[PDB]
Design an enzyme around this catalytic site. Structure first.
Site, mmCIF file in Angstrom:
data_model
loop_
_atom_site.group_PDB
_atom_site.id
_atom_site.type_symbol
_atom_site.label_atom_id
_atom_site.label_comp_id
_atom_site.label_asym_id
_atom_site.label_seq_id
_atom_site.Cartn_x
_atom_site.Cartn_y
_atom_site.Cartn_z
ATOM 1 N N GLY A 1 47.407 41.485 48.372
ATOM 2 C CA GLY A 1 46.993 41.516 46.970
ATOM 3 C C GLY A 1 46.069 40.364 46.704
ATOM 4 O O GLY A 1 45.302 39.970 47.584
ATOM 5 N N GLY A 2 46.161 39.817 45.495
ATOM 6 C CA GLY A 2 45.370 38.652 45.095
ATOM 7 C C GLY A 2 45.500 37.455 46.028
ATOM 8 O O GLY A 2 44.503 36.808 46.350
ATOM 9 N N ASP B 1 54.142 29.894 38.702
ATOM 10 C CA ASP B 1 54.230 31.344 38.741
ATOM 11 C C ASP B 1 55.625 31.860 39.121
ATOM 12 O O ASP B 1 55.774 32.862 39.859
ATOM 13 C CB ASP B 1 53.177 31.897 39.689
ATOM 14 C CG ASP B 1 52.880 33.366 39.439
ATOM 15 O OD1 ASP B 1 53.123 33.843 38.295
ATOM 16 O OD2 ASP B 1 52.413 34.030 40.402
ATOM 17 N N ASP C 1 62.933 40.751 48.148
ATOM 18 C CA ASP C 1 62.479 39.953 47.036
ATOM 19 C C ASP C 1 63.282 40.346 45.796
ATOM 20 O O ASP C 1 63.924 41.409 45.777
ATOM 21 C CB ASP C 1 60.945 39.988 46.870
ATOM 22 C CG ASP C 1 60.412 41.311 46.335
ATOM 23 O OD1 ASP C 1 61.017 41.897 45.411
ATOM 24 O OD2 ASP C 1 59.342 41.748 46.812
HETATM 25 O O1 LIG Z 1 54.254 35.057 50.144
HETATM 26 C C1 LIG Z 1 55.051 35.835 50.715
HETATM 27 C C2 LIG Z 1 56.012 35.326 51.746
HETATM 28 C C3 LIG Z 1 56.068 33.889 52.158
HETATM 29 O O2 LIG Z 1 55.226 32.965 51.570
HETATM 30 C C4 LIG Z 1 56.996 33.494 53.137
HETATM 31 C C5 LIG Z 1 57.871 34.402 53.758
HETATM 32 C C6 LIG Z 1 57.862 35.756 53.438
HETATM 33 O O3 LIG Z 1 58.718 36.617 54.031
HETATM 34 C C7 LIG Z 1 56.939 36.268 52.413
HETATM 35 C C8 LIG Z 1 56.926 37.710 52.064
HETATM 36 O O4 LIG Z 1 57.704 38.492 52.632
HETATM 37 C C9 LIG Z 1 55.990 38.223 51.038
HETATM 38 C C10 LIG Z 1 55.971 39.666 50.665
HETATM 39 N N1 LIG Z 1 56.836 40.517 51.257
HETATM 40 C C11 LIG Z 1 58.238 40.387 50.874
HETATM 41 C C12 LIG Z 1 59.097 41.583 51.225
HETATM 42 N N2 LIG Z 1 59.076 42.544 50.132
HETATM 43 C C13 LIG Z 1 59.810 43.788 50.298
HETATM 44 C C14 LIG Z 1 61.308 43.568 50.159
HETATM 45 O O5 LIG Z 1 61.506 43.157 48.804
HETATM 46 C C15 LIG Z 1 55.086 40.123 49.687
HETATM 47 C C16 LIG Z 1 54.196 39.243 49.050
HETATM 48 C C17 LIG Z 1 54.130 37.851 49.333
HETATM 49 N N3 LIG Z 1 53.253 37.028 48.686
HETATM 50 C C18 LIG Z 1 53.575 36.555 47.342
HETATM 51 C C19 LIG Z 1 53.314 37.581 46.235
HETATM 52 N N4 LIG Z 1 53.109 36.962 44.946
HETATM 53 C C20 LIG Z 1 52.375 37.664 43.920
HETATM 54 C C21 LIG Z 1 51.738 36.662 42.972
HETATM 55 O O6 LIG Z 1 52.237 36.866 41.643
HETATM 56 C C22 LIG Z 1 55.049 37.285 50.366
#
Ligand SMILES: O=C1c2c(O)ccc(O)c2C(=O)c2c(NCCNCCO)ccc(NCCNCCO)c21
Ligand SMILES: O=C1c2c(O)ccc(O)c2C(=O)c2c(NCCNCCO)ccc(NCCNCCO)c21
Length: 273
Positions: free
Chosen positions: A15-16, A135, A96
């Protein structure tokens, strides 16, 4: 040295903020996340001790990554010609908070109190390390499903904590305080407390309280769910319109509703196993 030390798995998000992949470290099979951010989209750079020119997120992640806490740690980072690549901790199994709430609807108060408290600890730790996340919301919170431990993830709109006014904001609008909407200015702590109020309402109501600017500026909070006389009070206090009427972290944590919080382990036993 990058694609040799880490083995990429499936894409986790994009995404962003860029792209995030599941990863394994070869050294020993620790789950990691691999975060690609493109140079072109970095609006905000900083500089480390040794004085290299890095994205702010890296500066910030470094300041909070010492010792244990509720913040997911930066394990290492790499530079490429058009991107920066960040290696972070990955809990296993993980989900999440957005999806979690999405799946179960509103959360039991006991479960919300546990989660909210852990968020409070995490934000304190950041504020302490001179970092402000800016955020806080359900989708920047990962849950380690086994240990019942919550973790903060995305420092991309972060900033160093300072006591003077902020005039930039990059977090989500629906989550931004009324002083931002009206004056394009806020202070860190009080704005954090506002977003924490949004987070808490969300946890207990299944949904966020405000959508449009006029609802944020109005600041009137309606409960679509049964919620205790007391959670309602804490939520309302965090969402006070005048910043100075909001509670400090300490006052939140001394709120009647924050009493007898569960430990993460028993939280998982009761609510995740
Ligand atoms: O940043 C991570 C992240 C991390 O910094 C360290 C370890 C991680 O496992 C993640 C991460 O998994 C992640 C995203 N996927 C999460 C799994 N989502 C599906 C189950 O709820 C999906 C998105 C994501 N980026 C942040 C999204 N934020 C949106 C801004 O408002 C991350
Ligand atoms: O997260 C957003 C959101 C965003 O990140 C960026 C832009 C947006 O416009 C939203 C958003 O509109 C949103 C929700 N809708 C608001 C209506 N609720 C109050 C009645 O005005 C309602 C809920 C909501 N968050 C989901 C909460 N997690 C549980 C999943 O149902 C959002």
């Amino acid at each position: 040295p990058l694609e040799s030390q880490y083995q990429v798995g499936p894409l986790l998000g994009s995404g962003g903020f860029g792209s995030v992949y599941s990863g394994i470290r070869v050294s020993d099979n620790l789950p990691v996340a691999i975060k690609h951010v493109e140079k072109d989209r970095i609006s905000d750079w900083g500089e480390l001790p040794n004085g290299t020119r890095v994205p702010m997120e890296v500066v910030l992640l470094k300041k909070v990554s010492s010792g244990f806490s509720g913040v997911i740690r930066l394990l290492d980072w790499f530079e490429r010609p058009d991107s920066f690549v960040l290696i972070l901790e990955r809990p296993e199994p993980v989900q999440d908070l957005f999806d979690f709430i999405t799946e179960r609807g509103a959360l039991q108060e006991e479960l919300a109190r546990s989660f909210f408290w852990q968020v409070l600890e995490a934000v304190r730790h950041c504020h302490n390390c001179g970092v402000l996340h800016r955020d806080i919301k359900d989708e920047n919170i990962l849950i380690d499903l086994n240990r019942g431990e919550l973790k903060l993830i995305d420092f991309g709109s972060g900033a160093l904590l300072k006591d003077t006014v902020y005039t930039d904001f990059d977090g989500t609008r629906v989550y931004s305080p009324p002083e931002w909407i009206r004056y394009h200015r806020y202070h860190g702590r009080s704005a954090a407390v506002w977003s924490l109020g949004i987070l808490l309402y969300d946890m207990v109501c299944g949904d966020i309280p405000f959508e449009h600017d006029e609802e944020i500026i109005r600041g009137q909070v309606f409960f679509r769910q049964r919620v205790s006389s007391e959670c309602q009070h804490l939520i309302r206090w965090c969402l006070a319109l005048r910043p100075s009427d909001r509670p400090t972290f300490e006052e939140i944590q001394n709120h009647p509703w924050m009493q007898d919080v569960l430990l993460p382990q028993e939280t998982a036993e009761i609510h995740l196993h």
